[PDB]
Design a protein around this motif. Structure first.
Motif, PDB file in Angstrom:
ATOM      1  N   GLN A  66       0.987  -1.402  -0.139  1.00  0.00           N
ATOM      2  CA  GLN A  66       0.371  -0.005   0.213  1.00  0.00           C
ATOM      3  C   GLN A  66       0.418   0.890  -0.377  1.00  0.00           C
ATOM      4  O   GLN A  66       1.826   1.041   0.924  1.00  0.00           O
ATOM      5  CB  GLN A  66      -0.594   0.064   1.129  1.00  0.00           C
ATOM      6  CG  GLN A  66      -2.118  -1.157   0.512  1.00  0.00           C
ATOM      7  CD  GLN A  66      -2.620  -0.919   2.330  1.00  0.00           C
ATOM      8  OE1 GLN A  66      -2.172  -0.449   3.617  1.00  0.00           O
ATOM      9  NE2 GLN A  66      -3.918  -1.640   2.375  1.00  0.00           N
ATOM     10  N   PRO A  67       0.601   2.172  -1.388  1.00  0.00           N
ATOM     11  CA  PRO A  67       1.880   3.015  -1.205  1.00  0.00           C
ATOM     12  C   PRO A  67       1.754   4.617  -0.417  1.00  0.00           C
ATOM     13  O   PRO A  67       0.052   3.819   0.143  1.00  0.00           O
ATOM     14  CB  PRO A  67       1.973   3.820  -2.869  1.00  0.00           C
ATOM     15  CG  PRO A  67       0.586   2.825  -2.947  1.00  0.00           C
ATOM     16  CD  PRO A  67       0.640   1.929  -2.254  1.00  0.00           C
ATOM     17  N   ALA A 116       5.225  16.254  -7.515  1.00  0.00           N
ATOM     18  CA  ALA A 116       6.360  17.750  -6.616  1.00  0.00           C
ATOM     19  C   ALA A 116       7.572  17.581  -6.445  1.00  0.00           C
ATOM     20  O   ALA A 116       8.409  18.423  -6.132  1.00  0.00           O
ATOM     21  CB  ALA A 116       5.958  18.438  -5.002  1.00  0.00           C
ATOM     22  N   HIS A 117       7.972  16.689  -5.844  1.00  0.00           N
ATOM     23  CA  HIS A 117       9.389  16.048  -4.986  1.00  0.00           C
ATOM     24  C   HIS A 117       9.881  14.920  -6.234  1.00  0.00           C
ATOM     25  O   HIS A 117      10.932  14.762  -6.029  1.00  0.00           O
ATOM     26  CB  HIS A 117       9.712  16.278  -3.726  1.00  0.00           C
ATOM     27  CG  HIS A 117       8.724  15.278  -3.111  1.00  0.00           C
ATOM     28  ND1 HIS A 117       7.600  15.128  -3.038  1.00  0.00           N
ATOM     29  CD2 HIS A 117       9.303  14.019  -2.055  1.00  0.00           C
ATOM     30  CE1 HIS A 117       7.069  14.443  -2.142  1.00  0.00           C
ATOM     31  NE2 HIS A 117       8.035  12.890  -2.051  1.00  0.00           N
ATOM     32  N   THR A 118       8.963  14.449  -5.760  1.00  0.00           N
ATOM     33  CA  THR A 118       9.624  13.006  -7.648  1.00  0.00           C
ATOM     34  C   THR A 118      10.089  11.941  -6.441  1.00  0.00           C
ATOM     35  O   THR A 118      10.742  11.270  -6.823  1.00  0.00           O
ATOM     36  CB  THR A 118       9.935  13.257  -9.233  1.00  0.00           C
ATOM     37  OG1 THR A 118      11.342  13.775  -8.204  1.00  0.00           O
ATOM     38  CG2 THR A 118       9.541  13.940  -9.335  1.00  0.00           C
ATOM     39  N   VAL A 119       9.573  11.982  -4.997  1.00  0.00           N
ATOM     40  CA  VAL A 119      10.385  11.201  -4.168  1.00  0.00           C
ATOM     41  C   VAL A 119       9.047   9.819  -3.630  1.00  0.00           C
ATOM     42  O   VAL A 119       8.570  10.882  -2.677  1.00  0.00           O
ATOM     43  CB  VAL A 119      11.263  11.315  -2.926  1.00  0.00           C
ATOM     44  CG1 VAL A 119      11.623  10.985  -2.940  1.00  0.00           C
ATOM     45  CG2 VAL A 119      12.412  11.800  -3.878  1.00  0.00           C
ATOM     46  N   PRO A 120       8.593   8.980  -4.117  1.00  0.00           N
ATOM     47  CA  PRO A 120       7.562   8.329  -3.632  1.00  0.00           C
ATOM     48  C   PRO A 120       7.498   8.208  -2.263  1.00  0.00           C
ATOM     49  O   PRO A 120       8.873   8.004  -1.630  1.00  0.00           O
ATOM     50  CB  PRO A 120       7.199   6.824  -4.364  1.00  0.00           C
ATOM     51  CG  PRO A 120       8.260   7.284  -6.141  1.00  0.00           C
ATOM     52  CD  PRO A 120       9.059   8.006  -5.385  1.00  0.00           C
ATOM     53  N   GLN A 121       6.191   8.589  -1.398  1.00  0.00           N
ATOM     54  CA  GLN A 121       6.194   7.922  -0.037  1.00  0.00           C
ATOM     55  C   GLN A 121       5.986   6.927   0.323  1.00  0.00           C
ATOM     56  O   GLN A 121       6.012   5.973  -0.566  1.00  0.00           O
ATOM     57  CB  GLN A 121       4.962   8.823  -0.006  1.00  0.00           C
ATOM     58  CG  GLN A 121       4.932  10.056   0.639  1.00  0.00           C
ATOM     59  CD  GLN A 121       5.525  10.750   1.597  1.00  0.00           C
ATOM     60  OE1 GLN A 121       6.111  11.464   1.351  1.00  0.00           O
ATOM     61  NE2 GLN A 121       5.569  10.240   2.819  1.00  0.00           N
TER      62      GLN A 121
END
Lengths: 110, 110
Positions: free
Chosen positions: B21-22, B29-34
């Motif tokens: 579950q992502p 915006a910051h292009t870093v997946p949580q």
């Protein structure tokens, strides 16, 4: 066999018997096939005196000294063939045992 | 060499994973997946195995046959049991034999 000071006089015993059985269960140590000389003599007319039966068993085998001895605190077996189903035979009795090798045996070329 | 039974088609490897579950998606915006939501699954695992066996045909012998040695623990306590305290009160110490238990129990004629 009656042993007398006169001498040894053999005489029929109408009451005697022999007790024969075969292992189809292979439940006693199988002693045949080790090439030990008990066989019918090549000459018919040479009586074949049946070999006694015995079997090797192992104990715990320890090197105590120059001489190794088996203390037999394990793995020692005692087979009384007396205790097994056998067929009492007597004068005038016919006992036969038929046996068939596996079909799986290889052909040995001559 | 090392174990029980080589098999051509073994028990399948049963692969399990948490359905991922992502985290909240960013508005590009910051292009870093949580990182995925931290979670873990707990479940019962039933595993049953059936063994084919044959009851022992006892060698027909007159001797009582000494059993395979019962396990021994270094501790001296009974094996495979919960011992109250080994220099602690806190948790019991499950005790396994000093040496590997061997499945060889009674002799059989070879």
């Amino acid at each position: 066999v009656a042993t007398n000071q006169t001498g040894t006089t053999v005489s029929d015993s109408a009451s005697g018997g022999i007790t024969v059985f075969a292992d189809d269960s292979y439940d006693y140590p199988y002693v045949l096939g080790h090439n030990q000389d008990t066989l019918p003599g090549h000459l018919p007319g040479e009586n074949y005196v049946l070999p006694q039966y015995g079997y090797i068993t192992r104990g715990r085998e320890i090197d105590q000294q120059n001489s190794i001895v088996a203390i037999s605190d394990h793995k020692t077996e005692l087979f009384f063939l007396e205790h097994h189903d056998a067929e009492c035979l007597g004068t005038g009795d016919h006992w036969s045992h038929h046996y068939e090798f596996p079909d799986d045996l290889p052909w040995r070329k001559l | 060499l090392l174990g029980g039974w080589g098999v051509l088609t073994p028990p399948p490897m049963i692969f399990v994973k948490l359905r991922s579950q992502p985290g909240p998606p960013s508005p590009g915006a910051h292009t870093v997946p949580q990182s995925n939501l931290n979670q873990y699954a707990i479940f019962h695992l039933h595993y049953s195995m059936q063994f084919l066996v044959k009851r022992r045909k006892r060698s027909r012998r007159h001797n009582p046959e000494k059993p395979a040695p019962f396990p021994t623990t270094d501790s001296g306590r009974m094996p495979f049991t919960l011992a109250n305290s080994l220099k602690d009160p806190n948790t019991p110490v499950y005790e396994v034999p000093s040496d590997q238990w061997i499945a060889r129990n009674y002799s059989h004629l070879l």
